[PDB]
Structures are given as C-alpha cells and as structure tokens.
C-alpha cells in the first residue's frame, strides 16, 4: 500500500541489529522537525544500544506495548496524530488488513509507516 | 530565532531564480511526507517556471496573497496547521517581530520557516 | 547460517532505495580498509544514485554479472579472497544451498555476506 | 553587476549548510565540462561534508586562501583563467569595488561569480 513499507532482517540476531542502526540513525538525524517514534521495539534495543548506536536521542521516542495488537493500535495513533515523520513497528504477523490500517493512519498524519520483521 | 532562516539573492533577476530552483526542488522532494507550501511568490515563479525548474508539482502548494501583511498572515497559518514541512515566504521588509511570529508558528506546526528576499 | 544475512525491502521501489542508502553508506565509509563490493546490483543503482546517496565511491567495487547464477559465483569469489569486508548480493531466488555457499565463502575471506531482496 | 550574484544564508549554521548543498550539487553537475571551483570555503565544508552532500567531487577544485583578501585574489584569477564555469567565494565584507573586480574577471573567463555569505 501507500505510506507503508516493510523491512525484514534475517541472520545472527546481533548482525541484524547492526544492519538496522544505520537506518534508524538516518531517519532520526533527518531533515524533518518531527519525531521518529519506535513502537514496542524488541528487548534488544537497550537504552544503551540506542546511544551506542548513536541515537538522535533528543528526537527518538520509544513507546511500549504489551500486545502485538496493542502495538498495532499505538502505531496507528502515533501515525494519525502525525507528530512523527516515521513510526516504526515490529509487528508479526501482520495481516493485509493491519497494513491498510497503518497505511491510512500514515497518510492522515502525513507520515510514513515502516514495519520491521527481525528474525 | 528557531525554525526560521532567511535566504537573500542578489544579482540578475534571472540568475537569482536559477540559484533558487535547486533549493525549492530539494525542499520539495524531501523525506518528510508533508507539503512544501510557497506563499505569495513573486510573478517570476510562473506556472511554467515551476515545471521547467522540474519540481515535484504533486508536493507543492502555491497560495496567493495581496498584502505583504496578508502574506505574513498566511505564512503563519500554513506553518501553524503543520501540514507543510516548510513554508516559504517572500517577505520584505520583515520586522524582528514578524520573524518571531513565523518562528513560533513554525515550532507549533513542527515545521520550518524560510523567507526569501529576491533582488 | 554464519557470516550471512538477508535484508528484504518491500514498498515503493523508490522509497526502498532510500531505506537502502543509509546501510550501503555506513558500510562504504567504514573502518575496515577493505572493499565493500556490490555484485550485480539492480539498474536503480545508477552511477548518479550512488554519489547522490552520499556513498564513498573510493571504497566500492561494483561488479556486473549476467546470470542470477553468475552473480552467485562472483559473490562467492569476492568473499573468498577476503579483500572485501562485505559483499552485497541481490540474488533471488536463493536456495538454502546457495546460502551455505555464500556463508563458507564469507568465512574463508573473513568477510560478511549480505543478500538484498528488493521488491 | 554582471556575471555576479550573492547568496546570503542566515539561521542555524547547520541548516544553512543544508540549504547550500542543493545549490553546490547543481553547480557541480553543471553541463559545462569546466571546473566548479570553491575558494576559501569555511571549515564546515569538510572532506566528508562534500561527499555526504552528494557533490560530484571529481569535478571540484577546492582552493585554500589565508586572507579574506588573498581569497578575493584567487577568486579573480580562477574566474579570469576561463577554466571554471563558476567560482564560489565566501567573502565578507565585499566592497562594491571587489564585486566589480569579480564581475570583470567573470566576464573575461566566460564564467559566473557567486559569493556566499554564511551566517
């Protein structure tokens, strides 16, 4: 769909995080004045991992969710209110429906939905 | 101030436009999914000039104003609403007050104010 | 396997290249004095795309291959002489066999095999 | 004058550089097979900044000057030699005299003089 894209990373759990950093970093220190919010990221993304990764720290919000369903909910709110240029999800599985939901929320907020499937 | 910047171009009126194109083009084809609105741009920026400057016409708004004061008004609304990542003004003169106004409007809309003084 | 990882990107062909730049860039301007070689990259990766994406062309080998099989061959040679810290493949499909081949080639050359599935 | 134009950028030192990149990038990829020479550019323009800004490095001549007067000298030679389509200066202050000097040097070499006032 529109305003939606999915990034899949397979290989050593560690090397996957490595491959991810540059992307997260590129988005955060981006030209936009809005935020890059991460939603329900996996345990791996430690408070330390982020700064070691070189987080734009001041411009990277990290919300927590309990349900792989609550996450799809937050992700949509985040996008919709559009105070984030990018909202990163770590949702799996992800129905063709769920996607359309993110897609619409993304377009309303004039934002981008990026879903990351680690492992 | 913050979220504010001014670009001044002096020299052959033609050159100036040439030097401007790359910037508008760059602003327009940017990563934040919101609009790039131009407010009360000078006559030069013809309907043709824009496409010839080959700018992504499906991400560019071009509002018109009658008063160099009405323009400062629109520019502030545009920024406030926050559906534009950048709102380009062509205001002169521009009081230290006026700037503060644009700066605040810009921060509320999580946007950028860019004022261009041609000539 | 080991020394192997796959990155999959789905969404607008354009926006996928965008998400890829940061990763290739980090890898190009790395520490390891060795080459970061790209093998049989899609047409998208223009001579221009590379410099526009801020890569460090002074540390990249962009080899061309005709067969999605010849690519798997070059990729293994490249890795094997371990003169490249990373060898990026754009192979699809990729048998569980092919992977093991890349994995071993990668370990011999003390390198990393990264396969990218665009689209 | 003729063959002369000045671009002034005010706001966050960083943003300003951002607004400049597009312009330099164009100039560097100009059709005119001749050189684009930058003269006494500010420290900001790091060896890295240039490649990160996607300028076609292979076509740039970055000459260094010690005096804001030596710069006006180099700038005039560069222009006067006829081997650069554009010669970018970072001179301030710049007398109405100095300009005329650049203007003539520019017309002799069939080139353009662009002076950039950062900050």
N residues, chain A: 119
The C-alpha atoms of residue A36 and residue A61 are separated, in whole angstroms, by 6
Strand, coil or helix: what is B86?
strand
Closest C-alpha among C53, D7, A18 to residue B12: D7
Question: Which of residues 77 through 96 in chain B touch A, CB cutoff 8 A?
Answer: 82-83, 85
Q: Which of these, B44, B18, B23, B8, lies nearest to B119 by C-alpha position?
A: B8
Neighbour-count burial for D72-106, b at 16+ CB within 10 Å, e otherwise: bebbbebbbeeebbbbbbbbeebeeebbebbbbbb
Query: C117 is written with which tokens?
Result: 């599935």
Chain C neighbors of D55, CB-CB under 8 A? 51
D52 in reach of chain C (CB within 8 A): yes
Q: What is the experimental resolution, given in Å to one decimal place? A: 2.9
* DSSP H/E element including C94: none
Concatenated DSSP letters of D6-26: EEEEES-HHHHHHHHHHHHHH
**Residue A96 CB neighbour total at 10 angstroms:** 7
Task: Give chain B's domains with CATH numbers.
Answer: 1-119 (3.40.50.300)
C-alpha span between A72 and A97 (Å, rounded)? 11
Q: Kindly list the partner chains of chain C, i.e. chains with 3 or more CB atom pairs below 8 Å.
A: A, D
Chain D interface includes B13 (CB < 8 A): no
Do the beta carbons of residue C56 and residue C34 sit within 8 Å? no
Instruction: Specify whether the CB–CB gap between D86 and B18 falls below 8 A.
Output: no
Phi-psi region of A112 (alpha: psi -120 to 50; beta: other; left: phi over 0): beta
* C63 inside 8 A of chain A by CB: no
Tally of CB atoms within 10 A around A59: 18
Q: Across-strand partners of A35?
A: A84
Q: State the Cα–Cα distance between residues C105 and C87, nearest whole angstrom.
A: 10
Contacts of B53 (CB under 8 A, 6+ apart): B17, B21, B24, B25
Query: Which residues does chain B have within 8 Å of residue D5's beta carbon, measured at their own beta carbons?
Result: 9-12, 15-16, 19
The answer to whether the beta carbons of residues A60 and A28 sit under 8 Å apart is yes
**Is A25's Cβ below 8 Å from some Cβ in C?**
yes
DSSP chain A: --SEEEEEEEE-HHHHHHHHHHHHHHHHTSS-SSEEEEES--TTS-HHHHHHHT--GGGEEEE--SSTTHHHHHHHHHHHHT-EEEEEE--SS--HHHHHHHHHHHHHTT-EEEEEEE-
Experiment used for this model: X-ray
Task: Kindly identify which residue of chain C lies nearest to residue D52, measuring between CA atoms.
Answer: C54
Contact D37, D13 (CB under 8 A): no
Evaluate the CA torsion angle D73, D74, D78, D79 in order and state its sign. negative
Which chains have 3 or more CB–CB distances shorter than 8 Å to chain D?
Answer: B, C
If you search the block for the tokens 């800004």, which residue do you land on? Answer: D53
Which residue carries 């200066």 as its tokens? D89
Instruction: Judge whether A118 is closer than 8 Å to chain C, CB to CB.
Output: no
Asked if C9 is an interface residue toward chain A (Cβ–Cβ < 8 A), one would say yes
Residues in C touching D25 (Cβ below 8 Å): 52
Q: Is C56 on the interface with D (CB under 8 A)?
A: yes
Q: How far is C37 from chain D (nearest CA, A)?
A: 19
Residues 6+ apart with CB under 8 A from D55: C51, D21, D24, D25, D28
């Amino acid at each position: 769909p529109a305003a939606f894209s999915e990034l899949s990373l397979s290989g050593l759990p560690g090397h996957c995080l490595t491959l991810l950093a540059p992307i997260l970093r590129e988005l955060s220190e981006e030209q936009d004045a809005r935020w890059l919010t991460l939603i329900a990221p996996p345990a791996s993304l430690t408070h330390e991992w982020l700064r070691r990764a070189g987080l734009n720290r001041e411009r990277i919000l990290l919300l927590q969710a309990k349900d792989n369903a609550a996450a799809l909910a937050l992700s949509c709110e985040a996008l919709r209110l559009g105070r984030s240029h990018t909202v990163v999800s770590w949702l799996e599985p992800l129905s063709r429906a769920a996607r359309k939901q993110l897609s619409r929320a993304a377009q309303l907020g004039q934002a981008q939905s990026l879903n990351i499937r680690l492992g």
